[PDB]
Ligand binder design. Structure first.
Ligand SMILES: Nc1ncnc2c1ncn2[C@@H]1O[C@H](COP(=O)(O)OP(=O)(O)O)[C@@H](O)[C@H]1O
Ligand SMILES: Nc1ncnc2c1ncn2[C@@H]1O[C@H](COP(=O)(O)OP(=O)(O)O)[C@@H](O)[C@H]1O
Ligand SMILES: [Mg+2]
Ligand SMILES: [Mg+2]
Lengths: 386, 386
């Protein structure tokens, strides 16, 4: 069959979508593409939205729509032919092979989700199937792409299991609905096949009555704590407390070891200080407590105990002074004894992991609370805020 | 003005939307207006060798009519009796009117059309409020009900979530039993003015897979609600083999008028005078109490009636048989009874039968089930079937 410029194979089916939709493997202009046939009485294409993207800067992780065309009964859309969807990346054998790690994948999808939003474009159907795995491009690498934006069902809403609770109270509505879905996807990737709600049949029902659950995340691991406090922030029943896409990118979830070590450093430099007794210092001491494991001077290694024993100065039941001690030993790292650098460092990876693995809640605890200074220039790398 | 002769239809005149892109319009077949359903061959297949079986035997008043099927390049069309609405609009649309017919005979009709299907060995597989239709005012004004959308097979999972029998999701080939289940849900759906047994939007199919069931609207002391409950909970039975056939449902006391029930009590009594008791049959209707009798039925009857049979006899009081026996006899000479006795009882045969039925809400239920040993017998053919 042909409509020109597409052009697809009658029985070369790629899969089946909702409301009769069907996707084939086709050609355009001479390259290989994917052809999605839609019933105009079911799905309404957003020309004014696809137009905005076309005329703005192109994003690596937001798929392209080469062109659209129609016949008597259908509307056709030519879309980059991808290898598979996120569901095959998560649930399938030893995949291929992969190419990108889960975390970078999450980041890419988020960047794209922030790109749409920057143009006032709500996907309102983000899910494992609308996140595509590109084909091995050139060097053999592979990245991920959001698709199926611009399409919107009618009647004369997204996919069950990834719909935001407010959607079902009653008509668009806002970007905050994409974040919820993203939140669910974040967990899906990390848990490697699990949904937070979580079994398909009663999934959307659990969403409505807030029946969350994040088992696969350990309550006392640094990595899992960071992720949990984010995912749950994103799947918040209350749309008002869900982070924007830009905020998610600025989350410690995506920070490297050296950046984690930098935030710890800046915070110390930031709190030295005022009353304690001070709106700020109180906040990071409010959680206390068990973050420090009662007394941090007791849970740090032996050689380090001897070193900072010379002062004085460092409370031990205080979070702030733990931060102060880390800064101190970071800055003076080169001047320390050989036995101290031999358990501490090296910098920056091993060093930060040294306090990170003994105090799982430290980073998380500090990031929250320190939001009081998110409007400050020093913390722009860490918060964004808008 | 689209034409696929013999079938014609004008788009824009859309009546509804179905699954997998299915569309329904107003149209014409011969000279009369029909409904046109346009299905995608990739989503729904039609069962011709079934719709013809119907064609052979004479039309059933309560089964929809299929006038003709034809195809074009890209679709498959079907012409059906243009009805007015679905069972949903009947129930949920408060201020519907007239409502022409009565809800219980609505349920009767539906079960009949159903029994007609199963006699031809046709399994519906998708019974629900959207597949039970309300015809338009026929001539004078009378309204009837019709089952529709039989002979439609979904191409990959039959039916609709929230009306599918449990044995069809464990998978490891449907029979008539699956329809009874759906009917059972619909029955309750109509009786309770729009509630579901399982029983709310999103999680009613999950609750079906674990055996939930909650018929809160049915009062355990109301004689009416007790009969409805015995039947309704036997239709939605988790075990299919414990669900009645469509024909059994028709013979059920749930449809019996007042005077027919009285004739059934009278029939039951006349039939047991008697074996011993000491008697297979009599032992049966005595088994369940006692509890049905309320320990002593002579104690739960009106005052002037106690006086009348205080000196008799004979009238055990802890006996079900003798409870029926006293009703029969007070009828067999109701004509001669005093004044204050005929008053508290009659008039016949309606208020008379309610006198005993409201004071013993498990009497009819208990008897009808205990007296099933004579299902085949010719006295009890108006009542049983088997
Ligand atoms: N651009 C594409 N490249 C390759 N496969 C695709 C593409 N778009 C869709 N598909 C395949 O077609 C299937 C149906 O897509 P769609 O009609 O959007 O429904 P859904 O995404 O809800 O499954 C998807 O599961 C996917 O595997
Ligand atoms: N013969 C008919 N007359 C009038 N309306 C109809 C008829 N058949 C179907 N419809 C309408 O079309 C809608 C969609 O029907 P269908 O595509 O079979 O899906 P479903 O039966 O699950 O709703 C129904 O809700 C019904 O209101
Ligand atoms: Mg897709
Ligand atoms: Mg219908």
């Amino acid at each position: 069959v042909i409509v020109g410029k597409i052009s697809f194979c009658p029985k070369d089916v790629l899969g089946h979508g909702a409301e009769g939709t069907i996707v084939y493997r086709g050609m355009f202009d001479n390259r290989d593409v994917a052809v999605k046939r839609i019933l105009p009485e079911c799905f309404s294409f957003a020309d004014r939205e696809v137009q905005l993207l076309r005329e703005s800067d192109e994003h690596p992780n937001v798929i392209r729509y080469f062109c659209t065309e129609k016949d008597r009964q259908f509307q056709y859309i030519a879309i980059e032919l991808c290898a598979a969807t996120l569901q095959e990346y998560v649930e399938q054998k030893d995949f291929a092979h992969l190419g990108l790690e889960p975390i970078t994948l999450l980041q890419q999808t988020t960047s794209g989700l922030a790109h749409l939003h920057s143009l006032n474009i709500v996907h309102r159907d983000l899910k494992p199937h609308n996140i595509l795995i590109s084909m091995p491009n050139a060097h053999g690498k592979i990245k991920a792409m959001i698709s199926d934006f611009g399409l919107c069902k009618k009647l004369a809403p997204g996919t069950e299991g990834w719909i935001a609770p407010e959607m079902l109270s009653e008509e668009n509505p806002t970007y905050t609905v994409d974040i919820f879905s993203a939140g669910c996807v974040f967990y899906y990737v990390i848990s490697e096949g699990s949904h937070p709600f979580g079994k398909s049949l009663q999934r959307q029902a659990n969403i409505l009555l807030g029946a969350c659950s994040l088992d696969c995340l350990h309550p006392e691991k640094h990595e899992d704590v960071i992720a949990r406090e984010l995912i749950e922030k994103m799947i918040a029943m209350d749309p008002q407390k869900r982070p924007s896409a830009k905020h998610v990118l600025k989350h410690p979830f995506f920070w490297s070891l050296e950046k984690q070590l930098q935030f710890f450093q800046d915070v110390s430099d930031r709190i030295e200080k005022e009353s304690l007794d001070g709106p700020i210092v109180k906040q990071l001491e409010r959680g206390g407590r068990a973050v420090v494991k009662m007394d941090w001077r007791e849970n740090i290694t032996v050689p380090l105990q001897t070193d900072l024993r010379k002062f004085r100065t460092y409370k031990g039941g205080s979070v702030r002074d733990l931060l102060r001690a880390m800064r101190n030993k970071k800055h003076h790292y080169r001047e320390l004894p050989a036995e101290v650098r031999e358990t501490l460092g090296t910098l920056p990876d091993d060093f930060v992991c040294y306090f990170t693995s003994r105090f799982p809640h430290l980073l998380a605890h500090t990031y929250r609370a320190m939001e009081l200074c998110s409007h400050e220039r020093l913390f722009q790398p860490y918060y964004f805020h808008e």
